Design an enzyme around this catalytic site. Structure first.
Site, mmCIF file in Angstrom:
data_model
loop_
_atom_site.group_PDB
_atom_site.id
_atom_site.type_symbol
_atom_site.label_atom_id
_atom_site.label_comp_id
_atom_site.label_asym_id
_atom_site.label_seq_id
_atom_site.Cartn_x
_atom_site.Cartn_y
_atom_site.Cartn_z
ATOM 1 N N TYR A 165 -13.484 25.594 46.569
ATOM 2 C CA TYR A 165 -14.426 24.521 46.882
ATOM 3 C C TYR A 165 -15.819 25.056 47.232
ATOM 4 O O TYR A 165 -16.826 24.544 46.741
ATOM 5 C CB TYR A 165 -13.904 23.631 48.013
ATOM 6 C CG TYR A 165 -14.861 22.519 48.374
ATOM 7 C CD1 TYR A 165 -14.910 21.346 47.620
ATOM 8 C CD2 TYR A 165 -15.735 22.647 49.455
ATOM 9 C CE1 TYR A 165 -15.799 20.321 47.941
ATOM 10 C CE2 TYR A 165 -16.632 21.630 49.782
ATOM 11 C CZ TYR A 165 -16.653 20.470 49.023
ATOM 12 O OH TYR A 165 -17.529 19.459 49.341
ATOM 13 N N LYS A 169 -19.759 25.089 45.052
ATOM 14 C CA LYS A 169 -21.101 24.792 45.576
ATOM 15 C C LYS A 169 -22.116 25.860 45.164
ATOM 16 O O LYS A 169 -23.236 25.531 44.764
ATOM 17 C CB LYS A 169 -21.093 24.620 47.099
ATOM 18 C CG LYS A 169 -20.060 23.618 47.641
ATOM 19 C CD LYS A 169 -20.185 22.224 47.022
ATOM 20 C CE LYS A 169 -21.377 21.460 47.565
ATOM 21 N NZ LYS A 169 -21.493 20.126 46.914
#
Lengths: 342, 342
Positions: A165, A169
């Site tokens: 995750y 980004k």
């Protein structure tokens, strides 16, 4: 003088729309469905200067074509706050990583094709997850700043969901900078990234609190609902109020000095203990009903990990941020008002 | 007798299909897309005893109506291994919790509607996540068994993404037992839950390794690519080989004694250090290139948390499980042979 805000129904995004409208901008937003688009325009009370487009899946590269084909000559500023609407943990690449990258690439290619000469500024809602070293946040000797990047690689980040995750980004922000570097002579816009830490603060509208608490405010909510003997989760990070994050997005496109910059929007450090202290001291209705922990042993009184040096970001933004007491106060009060507990 | 396997292209499910065909069952499976359906039938050699149906979204309550309407008379066993695809961490109720519950209620409603008098056994692929107390997994003085349930409530699990996901597994399995309790006179089937811990082991077909490693084997892969000076992730849990999980699903419907049971499929405890030790000890090509950590300090030599008491499950299943060395050896060897390292 029109500003496009993708995923305008978001926690941060609604405050952005709010501020934009208060500064007399014309605002165009996107939501995943007609119902959501209607709900939001209604929430803002049918403001003539606010309109919505429907963009159901931002993971697709053509998602933003219609909006820029229909309004591209009229859009001067693009605030891309939207993230891929869902993800999964198996096949991280196909279901999390690739969609994250395309989620940035798509809108930029839409700009290139239908608005290469009209869009002057793009602000990307990034994250401190693209800046930090998760394994090294606890090292008091280290310092992270605007030039720090998450060290994870496309392959290495796939180790587990959390790493994957945070990796997404990094690669999402990297694709933005890469697009501009390569297409600079083909597009007019300049780029800025806004990199928030843990985001607390009140929802724009009081009705929201029941369904729409973000990850950080959910931590506050759960703390408010724990029994006196229940265990306190171990968490360390930077904090920032959602309104300060929203304000930072405006400053990001308004000032010349924010061009080409990554802005870490963080006020100071916190642990759950710091949040508990505030809840106990400030809310009679909670006092005696929630955990107490070890008062005054959190990050508001001690240095507990790596130094987050965002002095450059603060200087460039030029406005002072809300402290932890204020942001938690507003977060907790709103939840307690929604629960009718006052 | 024809066995229905939902989500037949999953890590565990592919092994279930393999086993079923070897025991000369007719098999009907489901996959989210025609592409995946066709890829799976191809991989299994276009075996006419095996057929595939497309079910794009298991959380739609009519999702499985078509398969049970057309094949209901023939389907005697249901192996529900499929989980919702996609999820989101902001609105955990709408995007994780509700879909998990509906992904279970849907198929059971399909069975009641179209195969009430024919389906004899339902096996639900649940998870140790429905059993354990995540915050107490640390505590040696505590024991979890087949009668243990995750204490998290619908509201309380929403505190963070990990807790929410674990909560979703609890409520999914709860919905299954509840459905049977409330519909006992209107359906013929008996129910069994299979609850795996961390699942390691080889993918059914070798080509998969590039894209298709599950969360647990991804840990092994990541360890295999660390430098001698990298830090090792801190993780504790039970382990099980994928082939033993698959076999357990067959035993779960074949035996009378597994009717109405939750079966925790777990051999023993592990930490990443135990995995490291195996990788270093059994593979000359890895040793000297990956970390060593602190050999022999792991859960294969020490008690590092709560006791997982599944003696009842082991007795009922009636076969011995592969140990950590075996399952890691096969996981790593398949990856290394795919990487041409052998």
């Amino acid at each position: 003088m029109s500003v496009f805000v993708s995923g305008a129904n978001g926690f941060i995004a609604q405050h952005i729309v709010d501020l934009l409208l208060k500064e007399d901008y014309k605002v165009i937003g996107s939501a995943r469905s007609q119902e959501k688009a209607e709900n939001l325009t209604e929430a803002f009370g049918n403001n003539p200067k606010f309109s919505m487009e429907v963009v159901p899946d931002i993971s697709k590269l053509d998602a933003f074509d219609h909006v820029f084909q229909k309004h591209g000559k009229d859009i001067k500023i693009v605030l891309h706050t939207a993230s891929p609407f869902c993800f999964d943990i198996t096949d991280s690449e196909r279901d999390l990583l690739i969609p994250a990258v395309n989620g940035v690439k798509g809108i930029l290619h839409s700009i290139k094709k239908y608005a290469a000469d009209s869009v002057e500024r793009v602000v990307l809602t990034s994250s401190y997850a693209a800046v930090f070293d998760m394994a090294k946040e606890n090292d008091k000797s280290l310092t992270f700043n605007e030039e720090s990047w998450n060290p994870a690689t496309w392959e290495s980040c796939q180790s587990d969901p959390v790493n994957a995750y945070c990796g997404s980004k990094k690669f999402a922000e990297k694709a933005a900078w890469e697009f501009l570097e390569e297409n600079r002579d083909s597009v007019k816009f300049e780029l800025t990234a806004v990199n928030p830490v843990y985001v607390f603060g009140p929802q724009m509208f009081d009705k929201d609190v029941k369904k729409h608490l973000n990850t950080s405010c959910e931590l506050v909510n759960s703390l408010m609902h724990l029994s006196p003997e229940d265990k306190i989760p171990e968490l360390f990070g930077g904090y920032i109020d959602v309104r300060d994050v929203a304000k930072a997005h405006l400053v990001a496109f308004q000032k010349r000095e924010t061009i080409g910059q990554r802005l870490i929007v963080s006020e100071a450090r916190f642990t759950m203990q710091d949040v508990l202290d505030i809840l106990n001291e400030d809310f009679p209705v909670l006092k005696g009903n929630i955990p107490v922990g070890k008062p005054g042993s959190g990050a508001t009184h001690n240095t507990l990990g790596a130094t987050l040096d965002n002095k450059k970001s603060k200087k460039l933004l030029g406005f002072k941020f809300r402290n932890l007491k204020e942001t938690i106060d507003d977060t907790a009060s709103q939840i307690l008002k929604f629960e009718g507990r006052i």
